[PDB]
């Protein structure tokens, strides 16, 4: 049937997964990377146009900010060979030098690719995305580039971080949340306003191609 | 352990009426009874705010949503006033009919001093539209030099949304309920609900009562 063109995913449950396997939380994030690799390849083959993914303590953040570097070295080449285009959204200026540079190389490597767009939401917050959009628009109105009569929902959409996606694919058709949490977490509040929501108890590192197909199957049974 | 602000998407009125071989109008009158029951019960339990959204031949659906506050004023608001419930509307007023605008304002003016539960009606409401209208007002205040673009923060935007009239600690729903089995938010409080707990039930809105409200509050407490 109809495959949803844009899927949002809140990758929850890496810590619980690792605890369940009696391993450090760091092992869970590593397995979370594997799950993303599997899901990204499967969705690309099934014909999904976009996946926007969202990751959810002192020494943990050091290991977590090294994951984009690890992503670039051990996963990005295979994704690039699968014709996957890699982008990021969020306040990426806050990220460390090594992290921003690994992600930039992944963007540059894959920028000509014509398959699925893998969109990393990093240092991302919905309200903050909207806030900065409403700031830039107000600056442009103060500088007379745009009129206050030109302020519309379409204009706001052009100033969000999802602006770089193709116009018809900016808004998720489906938002998947793992690990049993029935809540929003400030992920794509604007873009996801009309999205089908799907909730599963399965933990993110166990979310595989079969779990993706079950989510896509649930989406088709809606309408 | 009661959530202070509960959002409610009231869906399933049409399905409820068609199941009983009755006209669609019958379903919406039963929907107003459900709202009365839920409003009274929530007020009793100590809920501070409920924001309600009537959502579901689109020309037919618009007539029922706009007829709501006229009938609600005549048949239900007096009892809510006696129960110390404050009534407020969020959404766009400019495009309302005359009889509807008068019925909403009479309901507001009647109940404006009440110190119990705030019943917040979302009528002619859209989240994206609300945020867009907030920008228009912020943009105009930047041109008038009342504020700088640098002053535009998350807290400022909150003061320009339709929920600004609620107290600052109660503006955002802690829980959002949707009836009729649909797993969507349908453009309801996208900003304000960004961190809300969600509760979905297959129950149709006219069957949603005090008991269903308490089952929802129970589920909310199991999250903590």
Curated annotation (Swiss-Prot), chain B:
It comes from Streptococcus pneumoniae serotype 4 (strain ATCC BAA-334 / TIGR4). The gene is uppS. It is an enzyme of class 2 (transferase). This is Isoprenyl transferase. InterPro entries: UPP_synth-like, UPP_synth-like_CS, UPP_synth-like_sf. GO terms for biological process: polyprenol biosynthetic process. The keyword Transferase applies. Substrate binds at residues 12-16, 24, 28, 57, 178, 184-186. Disulfide bonds: none annotated. One of its GO terms (cellular component) is cytosol. Catalyzes the condensation of isopentenyl diphosphate (IPP) with allylic pyrophosphates generating different type of terpenoids. The lineage of its organism: Bacteria, Bacillati, Bacillota, Bacilli, Lactobacillales. Keywords: Magnesium, Metal-binding, Transferase. GO terms for molecular function: ditrans,polycis-undecaprenyl-diphosphate synthase [(2E,6E)-farnesyl-diphosphate specific] activity; magnesium ion binding; manganese ion binding. The active site is at 11. Binds 2 magnesium ions per subunit. Pfam families: Prenyltransf.
């Amino acid at each position: 049937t109809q495959v949803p063109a844009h899927i949002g995913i809140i990758m929850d449950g890496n810590g619980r997964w690792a605890k369940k396997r009696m391993q450090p939380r760091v092992f869970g994030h590593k397995a979370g990377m594997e799950a993303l690799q599997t899901v990204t390849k499967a969705a690309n083959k099934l014909g999904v146009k976009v996946i926007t993914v969202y990751a959810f303590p002192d020494q943990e953040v050091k290991f977590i900010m090294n994951l984009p570097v690890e992503f670039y070295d051990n996963y990005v080449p295979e994704l690039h060979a699968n014709n996957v285009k890699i982008q990021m959204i969020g306040e990426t200026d806050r990220l460390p030098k090594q992290t921003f540079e690994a992600l930039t190389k992944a963007e540059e490597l894959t920028k000509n690719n014509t398959g699925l767009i893998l969109n990393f939401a990093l240092n991302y917050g919905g309200r903050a995305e909207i806030t900065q959009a409403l700031k830039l628009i107000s600056q442009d109105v103060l500088d007379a580039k745009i009129n206050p009569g030109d302020i519309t929902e379409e204009l706001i959409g052009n100033y969000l971080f999802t602006q770089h996606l193709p116009k018809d694919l900016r808004d998720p058709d489906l938002i998947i949340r793992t690990s049993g949490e029935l809540r929003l977490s400030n992920f794509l509040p604007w873009q996801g306003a009309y999205s089908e929501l799907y909730f599963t108890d399965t933990l993110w590192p166990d979310f595989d191609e079969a779990a993706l197909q079950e989510a896509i199957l649930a989406y088709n049974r809606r309408h």
